[PDB]
Design a protein around this ligand. Structure first.
Ligand SMILES: O=c1[nH]nc2ccc(Sc3ccccc3Cl)nn12
Ligand SMILES: *[C@@H]1O[C@H](CO)[C@@H](O)[C@H](O)[C@H]1NC(C)=O
Length: 344
């Protein structure tokens, strides 16, 4: 319970239901490293599916029932045995309560049942943290899992742009996108369309260079990592299971596998591996799983003999190739769990 809740002092930056958004914070005085983690949890794209989400997933739409504390786990742990990478950093967990893949900039109003303010929540958290020690940071790592991982890709350059405009050009803004690198591929049996409808429903915003490439009506393209990543200026480390369970879910794959499905699964991993070929900081194990960075046993998986905490440390060193300390770690074996270190 080591991170303490702070609801946003600007109570107009709200969760879906108009309750104030917030963040959980554990300060580490003397550390100039700040980790801001974006929670995931899918999204909702119209009044009717948002109403259903409000009935049975309300913590993802409201702060009314949030606990006063949370325990930092995985990359958010302050214990060096659990977090070899950044155990001494200032830890921030930003709850996902906007249902908009962290892209929205719309308030609840006469015409809007729900507020979708994910992009503004991030910017307000950053602004309020500056008075709490973030002004002295040397590195701000914006991390996230699942919808939060996509949120990193959508927001990392805006955070960098915010800090420059606020007069803090010495803070190095970086991104860590976990399990948010998806493919707009063909389903195995019969997301782009839901993201398309969602952006309109949310007033969703995408990075500016990506917006300018794809232009009006096509901003949904920027929710897909392989399309938005090349447009980003901030350093971004991409973590993605080659056979992500959420990718298979949207592909209508549910796991004695016959030839058609075997070929589909192998092609997906290849598509995967191909989109990461030009991503120099990446960690992509050949496993059927979902998320990594805030799991307590995130240290266990290895690609080519290197763990993710090591790869992230090598990435830090690279931002000061390195002998025995690699940053590009993508499995080449073609089937789930061909890497023996995959989670059970
Ligand atoms: O939070 C979780 N867990 N698994 C998933 C899968 C997709 C999403 S949103 C999304 C993001 C980028 C592209 C397409 C979509 Cl649809 N969020 N999510
Ligand atoms: C509160 O947040 C809203 C939305 O970002 C912004 O328009 C407003 O100016 C903020 N208020 C203050 C006092 O910063």
């Amino acid at each position: 319970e080591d991170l303490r809740l702070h609801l946003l002092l600007n109570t107009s930056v709200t969760c879906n239901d108009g309750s104030p958004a917030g963040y959980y914070l554990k300060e580490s005085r003397g550390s100039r490293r700040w980790l801001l983690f974006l929670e995931g949890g899918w999204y909702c794209f119209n009044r009717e599916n948002c109403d259903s989400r409000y009935d049975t997933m309300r913590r993802l739409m409201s702060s009314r029932d949030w606990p006063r504390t949370r325990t930092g786990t995985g990359i958010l742990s302050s214990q060096p045995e659990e977090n070899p990478y950044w155990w001494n950093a200032n830890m921030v967990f930003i709850p996902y309560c906007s249902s908009d893949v962290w892209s929205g900039a719309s308030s609840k109003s006469e015409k809007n049942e729900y507020a979708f303010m994910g992009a503004l929540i991030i910017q307000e958290v950053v602004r309020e943290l500056l008075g709490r020690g973030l002004s002295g940071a040397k590195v701000l790592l914006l991390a996230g899992s699942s919808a939060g991982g996509t949120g990193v890709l959508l927001n990392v350059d805006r955070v960098a742009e915010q800090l420059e405009k606020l007069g803090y050009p010495a803070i190095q803004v970086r991104g860590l996108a976990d399990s948010g690198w998806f493919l707009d591929n063909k389903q195995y049996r019969h997301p782009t369309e839901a993201i398309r409808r969602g952006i309109r429903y949310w007033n969703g915003v995408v990075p500016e260079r990506c917006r300018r490439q794809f232009q009006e009506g096509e901003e949904w393209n920027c929710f897909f990592g392989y399309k938005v990543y090349p447009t980003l200026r901030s350093p971004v480390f991409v973590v993605q299971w080659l056979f992500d369970e959420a990718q298979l879910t949207v592909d209508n794959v549910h796991l004695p596998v016959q030839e058609g499905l075997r070929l589909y699964i192998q092609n997906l991993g290849r598509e995967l591996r191909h989109t990461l070929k030009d991503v120099p900081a990446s960690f992509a194990p050949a496993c059927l799983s979902h998320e990594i960075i805030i799991r307590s046993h995130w240290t266990d998986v290895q690609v080519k003999g290197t763990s993710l905490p090591r790869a992230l440390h090598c990435w830090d060193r690279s931002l000061h190739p390195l002998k025995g300390c690699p940053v590009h770690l993508v499995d080449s074996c073609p089937w789930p769990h061909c890497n023996p270190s995959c989670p059970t």
